[PDB]
Design a binder for this molecule. Sequence first.
Ligand SMILES: [N+]
Length: 372
Amino acid sequence: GLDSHELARLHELARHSHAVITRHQDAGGAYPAAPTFSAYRGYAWLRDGSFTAEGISRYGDVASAGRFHDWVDGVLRRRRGQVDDLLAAVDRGEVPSNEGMLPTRFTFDGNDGSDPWWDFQTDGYGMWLWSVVTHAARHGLDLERWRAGIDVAVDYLLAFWDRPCYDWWEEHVEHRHVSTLGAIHGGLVAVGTCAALRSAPWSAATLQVAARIRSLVSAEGVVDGHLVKWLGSSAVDGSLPACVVPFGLVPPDDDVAAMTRAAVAKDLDVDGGVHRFAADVYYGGGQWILLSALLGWNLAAAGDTAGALRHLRWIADQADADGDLPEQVPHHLLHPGSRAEWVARWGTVATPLLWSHGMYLILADELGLLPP
Ligand SMILES: [N+]
């Protein structure tokens, strides 16, 4: 395993991961993406926030995780009318524009941070359902605290799960991304198998739609035995292992899960650093801490502890002076010529990225390395 040299370093990084996340949590409950990055600062994402919240929940700060769930819940209850209006529009056969849909960026006071025309995404609503159910399960909490917000997210996802949207990386609005479908699946299966939610009017519908997502991924999201980045594609994306653990399109032991871990490792993993996708020119297409953590998590879940440890150590070696984890590092770049213009425009890469720290805490936890 680890000598006390490593255990010591990994424990201290976990404590710092907790402190970074909780210190930068907004007064209202939102977890920001990155407090100091020009392009992300002042905004919260349900995707970043939900993995961040799961990290914090595993670590055991019930107060912080709860305040984040309270924030999301209240933001969604305020969208009850917008979501009812969208559904009624569908019922009249008037397919609403991407511009009228629920946002991707939120302000800390729960307003659209951006025009959904430019960044329409559905994965975050699915991740939040997964996050809040998993938190309530872990800590014996009453989901009625967050139920009215869960109802908004479920109603929204049951109507719009099969709609093309931008991927986690804000690309290709015309496609249906297997890690977006995966995130929605994980959320629907979480609420649909939750005994506290057995009487919800949407209970059985969540499992029927989760089955329709799995049908669509079987038909168009599997090539040469592995998942693909979007329906009708041959290529992989670094997010795909999330479709095994924790979103559960397939379990860890499934041959598609094995083939997907192997395809991601072969195509996108360089010396423990996982790239997003082959064409990625964002800061030259560097190695993403959260993707190394995600692949590590999935190797742990599949019984490959060694594989998991190698990725955790890789992540730990990217911690800076203060123990802050960046979004990505440039040790290997897919398109090195593109880096300078990004640094020039937006500054040095987001550091800390709270999602980097949340994924650190999850992988540490999967390996039994949180401080005791
Ligand atoms: N696990």
